Symmetry: D2
Subunit: 178 residues, 4 copies
């Protein structure tokens, strides 16, 4: 015979975009509306309380039937389970709100974020303002001593303003070796 | 003869919605992207610095050719000039970002906000979560000692949580005399 | 004593923008999703069937308890009742979808559209592409024999391509007498 | 030495969602605004003119310096090159508009659509109305003789109403063997 688990009407909201676009601020705006309504919310991170986790499946250990809203920040960093983990959470009737980068510094899709964008009921893509020219940005520029990082430098490198900048595609510079 | 002033490509962004929807937080998110880009921003209020003003036309006194972005919060409160003031600012090439309530406590259009929504290049309408039932809110409920305010009580009454609550239309209650 | 009619969770969606932005096409897209779901829809116009009406209150005569979705096109043209008419429809539990111009040819708010934008749960503002320069348009330019219409010519003038064009604010030209 | 090709300010717009959500209609709305502005547009499909192509890289053969806008429908069907092909088109200064399913019938990410959603400047996710319950849909249900298709049936199966239906997640049924 065939098996069928009946999903509940939870859902997923994805917030994504380059660094500096206010993804985390928008996650928190949404979460805050939640509290004015007196719902129970929890926020997860890698490394209302914010709870660090080393694996996606660890999220389960921290959850209750009491809880209404599950937020996860910096999702690009989450492991390969994260797609399944959020699907199951939504299927259980939770509002799952998820924020992370769409693209790494090369302009390539970051981690499981594209998959989350695909399965999500709602997607919000935020833009920053380009540092070089003032028009809408859609990229994170990595700089090293003022110089644009090469296409071959590591995908993951934890940092902030000291290494990163928002740019439109025109101003985005990712040099390759020949 | 006929006169013609050539507008520049400034524009208007309206952020609106009931109390508690995060209008001001979203104004500030937008303004903050501005600073990461090193643009000059100013924020106006009734009663990056926040500058109180008693009339809309007073905004002009505080502006420069240096400045790039003009934000105005709590726009429902601004006088009858505000439509013209923002049109002229945009026409001068500024990015004008404006936040205020769409509706008063009766569910009726608040101040000049509907007109601003009409002339604006961008409109963003934010929703809170309903306090009574947990579904998307689109109204501000006024309560007085737990009781829903009558349709005849003043349009303007400055307050916060001690008198106000977000609700969907179903849960919104505005009683009338007979 | 005080009276209170309990609203149902109907709602309003406003679609607005300059001529040529595809307001009517988007109204119909939405309406069409409705039919794939086997809901009962009706469309109203001034002058699934499209039904002309000379007054807003006339809409009532054409409605049923069977019906689920009420669409109204060219709302700028509707009389002063239209705000109340749509509020009551929503309050009765209908999905009310409404399309019309945000601005007349002068760049001023058109009819009751700003009020509808204020009371609506959802607002969608569509942009066309500017004819003069190719960037996003937000205005309807009126031309008469190639020449930009004066600020004093009538507010209402029924027409299409033979008199009208979409423009950004920079390219929008509304001359005034001196 | 290192190589650097300077991108132009073209961009990508993704339109996605379940079957029946009006993706193609919205592609055409956008394309049509283009024509009112007198820009040169072309539309591509798998199998203003609509041009069938068997490989993504074939798109190049059909393009000019004259052309301004490149639309591609049913993108889930396009091969592994499509991400690169659209990146390069945007990088060359074209407005690239792309429409396809976010999810296959199992609720899993379809083809290269998630990657396109990640690299795109704009993402629009459209919802249909659920056939079973009338609330917003976010899934395509596959039915075979009235019965929900198993999780193991082929990923690709060309069809329309005779096999497919839009549903919310609650009503979506994808049975598995045990
Ligand atoms: C753009 C980018 C950011 N990051 C990191 C830097 C920050 O710590 C984090 C985004 O907040 O992601 C990468 O690891 N790789 C990248 O390509
Ligand atoms: C909803 C509502 C708010 N307000 C006030 C209360 C707050 O001070 C402000 C919104 O932040 O507006 C009114 O004056 N009238 C109203 O109907
Ligand atoms: C822009 C504009 C359009 N119209 C009319 C022309 C069209 O018939 C209709 C929009 O489809 O509105 C006006 O009457 N006044 C205006 O200012
Ligand atoms: C939902 C779904 C649609 N399709 C096909 C059916 C249609 O021909 C096309 C969407 O228009 O994609 C699949 O091949 N697999 C799927 O899972
Ligand atoms: Zn730039
Ligand atoms: Zn409610
Ligand atoms: Zn223009
Ligand atoms: Zn359903």
């Amino acid at each position: 015979s065939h098996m069928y688990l009946i999903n509940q009407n939870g859902w997923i909201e994805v917030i994504c975009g380059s660094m500096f676009s206010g993804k985390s601020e928008e996650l928190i705006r949404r979460v805050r509306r939640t509290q004015f309504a007196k719902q129970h919310a929890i926020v997860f991170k890698p490394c209302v309380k914010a709870v660090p986790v080393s694996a996606s499946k660890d999220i389960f250990k921290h959850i209750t039937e009491e809880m209404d809203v599950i937020a996860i920040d910096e999702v690009q960093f989450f492991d390969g389970d994260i797609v399944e983990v959020v699907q199951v959470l939504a299927n259980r009737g939770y509002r799952v709100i998820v924020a992370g980068l769409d693209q790494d510094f090369r302009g390539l899709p970051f981690g499981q974020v594209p998959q989350l964008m695909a399965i999500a009921e709602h997607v919000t893509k935020l833009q920053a303002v380009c540092s070089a020219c003032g028009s809408p940005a859609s990229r994170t520029q990595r700089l090293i001593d003022g110089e644009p990082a090469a296409f071959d430098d590591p995908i993951i490198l934890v940092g902030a303003s000291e290494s990163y900048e928002p740019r439109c595609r025109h101003c985005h510079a990712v040099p390759t070796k020949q």
